[model samples]
Target: QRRLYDQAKAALAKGNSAPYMASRSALRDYPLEPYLAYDELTHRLKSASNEEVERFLTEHGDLPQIGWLKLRWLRLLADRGDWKTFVNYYDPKLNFTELDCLYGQYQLGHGQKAEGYATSERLWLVGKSQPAACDTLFGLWQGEGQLTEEKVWKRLKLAAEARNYSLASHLAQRLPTLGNQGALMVSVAQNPAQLSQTGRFSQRDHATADVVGLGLRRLARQDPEKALSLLDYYSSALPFSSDEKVAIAREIGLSLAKRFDPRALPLMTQYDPGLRDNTVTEWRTRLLLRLGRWDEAYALTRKLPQDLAATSRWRYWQARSLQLAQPNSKEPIALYQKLAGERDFYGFLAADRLSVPYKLGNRPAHIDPRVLQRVRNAASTRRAMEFFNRGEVINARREWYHAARLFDRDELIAQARLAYDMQWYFPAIRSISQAQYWDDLDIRFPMAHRATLVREAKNRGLHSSWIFAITRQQSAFMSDARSGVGATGLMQLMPGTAKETSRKFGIPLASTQQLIVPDVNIRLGAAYLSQVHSQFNGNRVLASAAYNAGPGRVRQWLKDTRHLAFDVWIETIPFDETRQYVQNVLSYAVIYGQKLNAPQPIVDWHERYFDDF
Candidate 1:
């Protein structure tokens, strides 16, 4: 390698950089040297013929070194309006996430690139640069038909900006409708006399409609009140739907926030679900603020469980809710000032509210405080899980690596499972083996000790793996896992479930204290799981759903969504916890099955979940 490096350098010293790159035929001379070749080829691209470049890539294309050379290749073709091949060539390197990548394609890909992305959002502000101003400018440019979707829409937005309603309406009416709502709107605006020719979102292709999208559109249009009404009416008892229950809860909360409307308070209060600890308590604290109950809000803030201590959003909001309360007597401006002292974004926002009053909308900066805070409190497992969900591949890759350094060998078993959940299978498989290098009892919760759990499960007519999966999901195999709301034990068995399970199985349990012991929790938990499994006639998927979301809700969900696929049904599950809870159990079941060398579980979840409902 050193001798080859010296040879390349000696060639580079000669006048031509191209010789350093070597002829497409000279590839055997520097076969392993991608870096040196990449350098020389990129330098020669301006002078090199396109045919020459194509020949070279074809020679070394299978090698990793030259794959990303597509950027220069695509842009050069795009400059000449050679869009057809540009599309084909750029597809391999297209990231679809980066604005630069998207913008490069926008400059060439028949202009559909910008429309597809900006229509959903301006580029998300998470990437390297703040894309808001550039994106909005692009939207303005695109709206002018200088970009595409036709020029009529651009004229409409510009006219709207200039307050030229009459002219805008005239042009929109004259525009053709092959596809250009944004453009035609200018003329449409001019003629209010023009009847609604056709509503844009009125689905022309799909027969089913979307209540959530409809609700969001109205909300974006600044009519949350009406959005609430439309959303509630559309929010059906049908089990499979994605109607944003928080939006529903808050829309009712919105009415209470504005006027002291009696009806709104009851609706907002109805969704409280009695604060069953951590995440819910965080949400509940916010709910208290929407209603003007500062005294109760202050107590809630002080008593917020420490599990959320890592994230400052809870602290910042808890403080804001208290200080901003007008009717309640214990408003704490002093505490608010103290809490807002930190420089983190939420802390800064809280400080801004304390010092300079204004409404703060969600933005990248503001989202940071919550993201960072969640990052702090998150179990390495849950941290790995969030990265998996958010699809920030870069961040996921980082956390997947970071999770290893944060735990003991035993804890690493769960960590491995977490990494596996993120699709970082190599690390997961590697970590699990390392876990066995040390003496960690399988510790896969109820599944770890087959002698103990398998016998009990079999006696109760339960599939041990299914019960193991449920226990891991519910309680992390931690018999000591206790919730602030008095739930206890490995199963996270609610006191009601515990008493019922104990009574049904004739186990002697006086109170919740007896429930926290490892043996007792597993025995009763296994039995309880057996009952839920029995309800579904050994259908593990439906039984798992019933375990997380009550049996009645699961039955109703099944009845309402019999036509929906399993994955979609799960995604659209109305209760957020239940929706995710079912997925987590099913997912863990598969992981456990694989770890134990069992046959792969069925995971085409769409079969029972909703796609759009």
Candidate 2:
């Protein structure tokens, strides 16, 4: 039973989606395999009956392996209108704030307006909970909840009537917690003003660009009309650059068209008219696809590079276009297949375009026994992190080929791949390990296995510390941890990337099973990182950012930051996403190198490289 459980876990860790589709799979068999439960719970909720829900909770509640499940299960029960059961386990554990919000919402639905308002107000007194608290109040009014709070209703309703949703939302949320007293205060506060206020979002600071973000966030639901209206109201001169403004507007229009608004079909302007870059062009084409303006989408996307054009978002839009283009409406199997072949988050999304039964797939893997042991050892402060750190370097550099080749009876290549995927980044080309790498405790760590990531990275002409940096950020060497994005293995390879890398390296990947093995993931990841590291001329910082944020974006940043020195360039990275990426990789590399007793590899000859270039 344990072996079966482990194998199922290993399968999910390697990015296989098939496990949850079967009842006997790892997620269903042993959910406590320390996998991400969001996808698993989501799938179960999609078709969960009361019986199945009860059985699931009963079966899995022996241990609280995850923090979010009980709440999620509660949400599922609420959706099913199982109010009695939901309420039975609702109090105390639910917390005062969450319970108030939930019960308020239920009351609002039943036209218990004053009660919902009270609960919503209570939650919002904390300030940040206003949006959520307001939601219940809004629902209450719609349900014709009693007009008990006349003064509050007048103020909130006035804002709603003006389409000042932002302020309306705020007032609605605050009133719920403050109840009758808060409502009276607001009535006196706005006696003669008539509820006229610009926007709290109005600002001239960095938040000036928040208008674009605001537009982007709502682009999905409001698309053409709401987005176009906001765009027209704000106009191009509003904080964002010409390029950014267009991108924001395009997203807004796309959002509108998604809601099936035919008027959104014709774009007012073709922005980025002269930009020849495929990536930017792909963005433009994606908006067109959303509007069902197929000709423009095709025209823009036709010459887009497969590597760039086939991004997860674009891939879905492309598949949808193909599906809609045909009268018979045959599913765009080919388009989905193409999408499934990549290493992006979109591969999981490719289900909509393929014969895959559902969109969300299997969960991440269990902690490898070896990795677990390392974590256990680390948990004891008596054993310095230095010992584990040194062992990590040794484990990454493990030479399996020579070890097995001496015996001359084993397939070294398979073993090496397995080793790399399992975080054994340093292995002699394709040798394997036979021991089960599991420990008794729930600990996540690096160097659970024997492989040499640092050496392998260097041999691949990359900085070794960046690998450590990546490991720190990606999983902190936790072999058991899984990402919401479905990246797995010690190096966090998207399964599509591994499959493609396997084929490119002439690796006979017997199944997706090898992907969870440390050797295989790291080897392919190293090769790919090697390519990027070379492109940046050994700047571990840039390569690390590229690894996290993608090479193309990093390339654009180089163009913008060529004049800035390292510190300035690092600090000025516009996106918080890439900025943090650079920091984590650079900092981790330094620590890991010192801990491993290795002289750190300098990324640049600062003066020489600058002078030479």
Give candidate 2 regions above 4 Å deviation: 1-89, 92-102, 105-115, 120-450, 508-513, 560-563, 601-603, 606-613
Per residue, candidate 2 scores C-alpha lDDT tens digits across 238-278 of 46666666665555544543333444434423554554444
TM-score of each: 0.32, 0.40
Residue 426, candidate 1: C-alpha displacement in angstroms: 22
lDDT of 1 by residue, 208-300 (tens): 122233233334233445554544443452222333455445544543333323444455556554443354454445444534455666677
lDDT of each: 0.52, 0.49
Model 1 regions lying over 4 Å from their true place: 1-447, 603-613
Task: Tell me the deviation in Å of residue 572 in model 2.
Answer: 1.7
* Alpha-carbon lDDT of model 2: 0.49
Best candidate (score: TM-score)? 2
